[PDB]
């Protein structure tokens, strides 16, 4: 009728939204869909570690004690030449402290 004869605007169609003004927004993500979850930043390693005191694990500053030893390992018995289980004749018995009177094990160890 009047006020709506020629100019007929039908803007309520469910498929489109109309409320985004149909201006597309070809991007407007700022991350430009490069990943989006890329700028979160958890642990991208900004340095290498954090501290890096001795660079590549340098224990040899100048405190080489080794009074305890343990540098050639050898977890297989002891000695690799003469050996002991090939005779076992220790004439050195001047070692005390050892309560070797109950070395029969029993159940007291």
Curated annotation (Swiss-Prot):
Source taxon at top rank: Eukaryota
Cystines in this chain: none
Protein function: One gap junction consists of a cluster of closely packed pairs of transmembrane channels, the connexons, through which materials of low MW diffuse from one cell to a neighboring cell.
Tissue: Highly expressed in lung.
Protein name in UniProt: Gap junction alpha-5 protein
Topological domain spans for side Cytoplasmic: 5-109
Similarity comment text for this entry: Belongs to the connexin family. Alpha-type (group II) subfamily.
Subunit annotation: A connexon is composed of a hexamer of connexins.
Residues of the full protein shown: 252 to 356 of 356
Subcellular localization(s) per the UniProt record: Cell membrane; Cell junction, Gap junction
This protein's encoding gene: Gja5
Region called Disordered, residue ranges: 32-109
List of residues that carry Phosphoserine: 104, 108
């Amino acid at each position: 009728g009047p006020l709506g004869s020629t100019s007929l605007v039908q803007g309520l169609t469910p498929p489109p939204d109309f409320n985004q003004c149909l201006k597309n927004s070809p991007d407007e993500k700022f991350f430009s869909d490069f990943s989006n979850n890329m700028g979160s930043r958890k642990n991208p390693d900004p340095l290498a570690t954090e501290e890096v005191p001795n660079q590549e694990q340098i224990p040899e500053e100048g405190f080489i004690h080794t009074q305890y030893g343990q540098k050639p390992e050898q977890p297989s018995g002891a000695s690799a030449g003469h050996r002991f289980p090939q005779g076992y004749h220790s004439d050195k018995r001047r070692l005390s402290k050892a309560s070797s009177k109950a070395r029969s094990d029993d159940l007291s160890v």
